[PDB]
Subunit: 380 residues, 4 copies
Amino acid sequence: SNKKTKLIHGGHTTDDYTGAVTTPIYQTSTYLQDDIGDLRQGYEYSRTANPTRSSVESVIATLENGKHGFAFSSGVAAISAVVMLLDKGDHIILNSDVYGGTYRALTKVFTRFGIEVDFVDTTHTDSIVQAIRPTTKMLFIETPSNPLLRVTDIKKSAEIAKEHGLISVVDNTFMTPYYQNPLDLGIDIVLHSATKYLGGHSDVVAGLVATSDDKLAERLAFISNSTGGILGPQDSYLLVRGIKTLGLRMEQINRSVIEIIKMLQAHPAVQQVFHPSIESHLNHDVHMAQADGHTGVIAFEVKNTESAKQLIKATSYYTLAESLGAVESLISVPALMTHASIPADIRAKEGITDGLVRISVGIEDTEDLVDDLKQALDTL
Amino acid sequence: SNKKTKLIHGGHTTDDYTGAVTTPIYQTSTYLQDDIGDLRQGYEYSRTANPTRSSVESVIATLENGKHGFAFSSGVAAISAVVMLLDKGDHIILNSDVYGGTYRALTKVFTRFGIEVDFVDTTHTDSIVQAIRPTTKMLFIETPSNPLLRVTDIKKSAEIAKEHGLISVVDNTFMTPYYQNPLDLGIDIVLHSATKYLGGHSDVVAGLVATSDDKLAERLAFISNSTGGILGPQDSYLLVRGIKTLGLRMEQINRSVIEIIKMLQAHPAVQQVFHPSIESHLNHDVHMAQADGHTGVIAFEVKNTESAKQLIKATSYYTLAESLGAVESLISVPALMTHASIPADIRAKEGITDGLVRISVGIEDTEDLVDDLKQALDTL
Amino acid sequence: SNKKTKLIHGGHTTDDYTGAVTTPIYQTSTYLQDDIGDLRQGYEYSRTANPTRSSVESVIATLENGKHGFAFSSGVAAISAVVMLLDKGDHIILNSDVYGGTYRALTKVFTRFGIEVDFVDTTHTDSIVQAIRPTTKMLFIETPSNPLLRVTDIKKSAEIAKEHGLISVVDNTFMTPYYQNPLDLGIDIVLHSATKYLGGHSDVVAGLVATSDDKLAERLAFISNSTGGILGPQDSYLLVRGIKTLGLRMEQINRSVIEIIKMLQAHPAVQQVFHPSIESHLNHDVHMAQADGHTGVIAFEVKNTESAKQLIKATSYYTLAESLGAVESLISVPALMTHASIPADIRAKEGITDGLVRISVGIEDTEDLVDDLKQALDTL
Amino acid sequence: SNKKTKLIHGGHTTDDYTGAVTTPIYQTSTYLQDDIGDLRQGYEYSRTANPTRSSVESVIATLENGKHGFAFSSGVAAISAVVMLLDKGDHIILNSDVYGGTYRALTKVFTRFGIEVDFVDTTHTDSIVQAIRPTTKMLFIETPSNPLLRVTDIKKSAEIAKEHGLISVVDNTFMTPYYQNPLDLGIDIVLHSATKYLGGHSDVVAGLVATSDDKLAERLAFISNSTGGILGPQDSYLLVRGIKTLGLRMEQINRSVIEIIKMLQAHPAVQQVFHPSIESHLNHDVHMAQADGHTGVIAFEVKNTESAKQLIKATSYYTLAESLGAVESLISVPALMTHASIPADIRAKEGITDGLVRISVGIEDTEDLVDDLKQALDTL
Ligand SMILES: *Cc1c(COP(=O)(O)O)cnc(C)c1O
Ligand SMILES: *Cc1c(COP(=O)(O)O)cnc(C)c1O
Ligand SMILES: *Cc1c(COP(=O)(O)O)cnc(C)c1O
Ligand SMILES: *Cc1c(COP(=O)(O)O)cnc(C)c1O
Ligand code: NA
Ligand code: NA
Ligand code: NA
Ligand code: NA
Ligand code: NA
Ligand code: NA
Ligand code: NA
Ligand code: NA
Ligand code: NA
Ligand code: NA
Ligand code: NA
Ligand code: NA
């Protein structure tokens, strides 16, 4: 029924055999057959299918309102499998500010395999229409993107993809299935770095993929079984476990996000703030139309590199680390950590200034997070 | 010093911090940085590197006398990463009877990316020389192969590869590093389905790769980080644990293999036996020159399908299941389980008859294994 | 600072060595010593101390404002260690309706060791004063108790214990450290079945103990090391992980508890409701004085056994299972499941009627839980 | 049939449901009931029973030829449960040199509960007969003992116990079920620190208990459920896994033990050697009558403390750490590590000289172990 209930009771996460209320961890590679070809419960080799992985796959399929779920050893393994749906000579359209790992995979791995790629600004969907070639087969979008949280219209993207015969893919990592369901808006394939919010505890690297399309599912299953980027059973179990508190965590994160943004907008040491909840944010109306909540990732400008480093040093509750979606609040400086290889003037041109700070809001107390960040900003 | 000692003390499998005599399981995705870019022990994001995975990587590099190790979520993920060393238009030579998963990956995935493939009989290395094209970049061999245990000359393969500028790869799964070390014979890259003997307990799906070549290692690391088919920390730990008894297990398996082969050769219900220890086996001398022991996989002919099924039913200690390298002895019928999609007459032509049985010898008592298989054969 | 922040940042749950943001799982039994007696980080044998167990111990000590934490293989192992603080001839006072496992341990195990026990109604603390003998050494109370949620004055209990030289113990399982901190009220020892709310995910059996008393801590450590009921490292890790969301889970549970109680009090098929939030509940004022929230366990009367079974059958979101503190809402019938060996008329006398239902409220949506339970009650 | 086969196929260590060839890890605390009291597979609460623990319990019961198995959180938790079979006023006879942890538990914990204890030299069984009091209820023996490997006649001990109505217990840790089966010789209860050889990999702290006596089993089950020193599911799984290679490990250890003893007896820097395989060892004939192999623990005298420390420093393959039964060879100095609180002259009187070294032989290469220890002794 309601989302917090579906998080607890959706999917198959109990043991039919013993009645165990949690998914057993099938730390196993192979299965007895009673007769050649006769599988007791459909299992025969863990690369092909493992019952704990099947549990997490059923969960992600349920939460995204799809039919089929797939668990990979990482978000970029999920992305790679989805790209391997294409052939040499096929063309992909992606949003221009796609995640660095995705950009790297496409432009340094899959271009060597003849897959052609264009990065366009999808905040205007007619950019997609202009970019479509006769060889285009896939449209891949993240929304909102990293680290400036650009918003793309999912439903229009899906209509465009259907009209031109494209496989549509949404990287729904930042929003999670709790707030945004791309398959409900016509998208063919939805994927996640479960490493972030879904696991939620900074202790699993994993990717999840969901689709309602039987034929795409068969192709993804063949690719998963053939290239073998499968998530193991212990990590699958921890994923199922972390997803149970997804709703509670996301709601706490959202309360803090809203209060933190009020503070940031008021503070004199802060210039621009980037987040889809701000009403002057580009495609704010689109985000509210396609989601019923917010990501916990916020970016905002301070004056320069030394101010950003000072901010990191002065916060007690914001931790300097890579990744997002932890229970801890995390802080980073894109220009030094994710974009340091881009020349400085191009960094500035894209908005990745020296003083651009990205925080990933955790589940600490809202007042503590607001007050800590404010006092650290006061030291500037 | 000696192999059984190197298995216990080779690689880094203790905790420098606490002194723990086993590798801690770093069930974690990210790491505190004391200052932007300053990593305490070189870790920053578990996809890129995880200390438990680093432990298993150091073990496989030590055991194969390489410099660099890589752990993947499965054997075919390892194979896929190695193939992704190439580009569209490049050509690979593989032995004709390569593992079905490898065949499937190459001919149904990577050919769509423009990688060209020829399967040749490498039991005569001049077949390799004849197959070399101007676009050939890689030579990939298994020895001994599945399920007829064809033997390929590793050292000559390496000389050919060096002369023609090819990356040489050996799938050393069936022999393990305990009996055969392709890097010592000039091969560039050695890989394993650690799912089989190395893990040894039927409870991990994993691949391992080792090389001494710094530049190949850098390319493999980039591919691993970009496509993300990484082995998780719990599975890495179980791999390090299972490898400790590799030598003891392989030696028990070899004692049973030798006695079982004597029995099979004597038995009237058994026709051909395939195993590199038999002196009339093709390239027996080559195997003895490049290995100091034997794989536990044996294939042998009984009369027909019903005899093979009867054999499976009548053994108490041979278990019907997929995979090999378990502590249990495993039994299978290739024509029904791994080659059932090949038309029957071509199956027969390749030697995959209806009565071809494959056993993977486990670590049960030698007399029990011999006697059980013999009494079951006596029921034919 | 505030509780939700302390839950994330309190205790030591990162790796000082690698910087890992989660506690490494030290699946290990022993530790290298650089010289006889010279321990690298104080570890020498995992029964005596394990770094992952030390992490969970530091967490429980922080959350209860104690100095010393102890993790046991189960709640009753924790209780047993605390009772083993006493000697033959010593006497314990416990509340009359103590948990069945505690009652069983005391009256069927420790009485055979000469420990003397009286169960008194501690809702009036002068009952404690009357029960004190010259041999009394310990006062052990749960509040609120199971399943009628009787409330005992913790602070007065502590004053009585101090005046008479008793070790005071509170089983704080039902409230958790998030809502009630007995050590802050003068109690010597606080314990928990971490199997319930602290783990929070129905996937760990564990006990936790905290004290500020150095000498009691030394005695508990000696008992733990000597009788060996220690929690293992994987379960310790899962405990640290589950505790991160304790605050969010307890707050969701409390919102549902309040709405469910309104519904139950209104419903014609429900007679008595037992919960400390009800203002006519005995010692309601005491509970509000010593806690700032509520347990999720509620008991209420329906007409008879068949009504209780019907209620269980008709709810979609209340699961029939043992234990409490899950993410799922759980339902049970004490008279059939926890008190079936007590003769019927004595059951009735204690208030354990045939129609007494106990629910443990989970973290499903509040409206779903209210509506589901109400429609099932409407079928009566 | 034969031991190495029974190790692989004895007990229930597969999943009946999915056919998984390894025991699933039931990381779970409770179980759905389809109707009040109707348990799907007999499980209802993991403290009472967990299917992974049930797997390891079935293994130890099979390997010791008993009916009932019990897994505890540690060896001393197993010992404590067995002692809790008795009441205040009951008396136990134990061998005089019982393990320090056992001595500490009995004399510092259970004597406070009125259990009376005498330590007698059981190498002459008439010492047992002389020590029997009218209150004696239990006879507890280790053989061979630590660290001087004194041997006690198990069968005569059992006859004495039967004649006088005593519960007989053997701590079979040092021999393992692979070489010595006390239940086959009339003993009531056999126990192990599975922390040592059975787990075999220095990564689990655990105890195991086996009996054929239904009534003793019922009492042990009640004590386990009431005091809760249960082994968790992950540790149970690792135990089942390590036991698979028990036979191979013990046989390698025994080959090295025999060669190492030849070397030690020849070496001029070594005086006395203590091990049951030496024909002049007291009760050598008894050991050979009741066991078909040897423990890997050896003790031997060098001149003094500085020689012992030098020996530790000079070995490459003997590791300074607590515990035994690892895959690594371990070395220690009892007088400094396990008996340092005993006054020096009493230490000397018992044979725990300053130069007494204890090694626990691992599974490294026999020649490496012999040569390493010999060259280190040559440096004296
Ligand atoms: C409510 C509910 C659903 C249906 O969810 P929708 O968002 O309406 O598609 C599915 N599963 C469970 C367990 C639910 O509670
Ligand atoms: C013997 C030994 C080596 C060297 O092995 P080689 O086979 O000679 O290359 C490395 N590490 C350890 C721990 C060893 O014991
Ligand atoms: C606030 C805080 C504390 C102190 O908690 P009190 O309830 O005031 O005793 C301790 N640790 C952390 C991490 C905190 O945030
Ligand atoms: C041989 C065997 C047994 C019987 O063992 P004994 O030592 O004869 O009691 C039991 N189980 C299995 C799996 C066996 O192989
Ligand atoms: Na469900
Ligand atoms: Na669709
Ligand atoms: Na900070
Ligand atoms: Na080493
Ligand atoms: Na080379
Ligand atoms: Na069989
Ligand atoms: Na902390
Ligand atoms: Na106090
Ligand atoms: Na129900
Ligand atoms: Na079995
Ligand atoms: Na008996
Ligand atoms: Na040494």
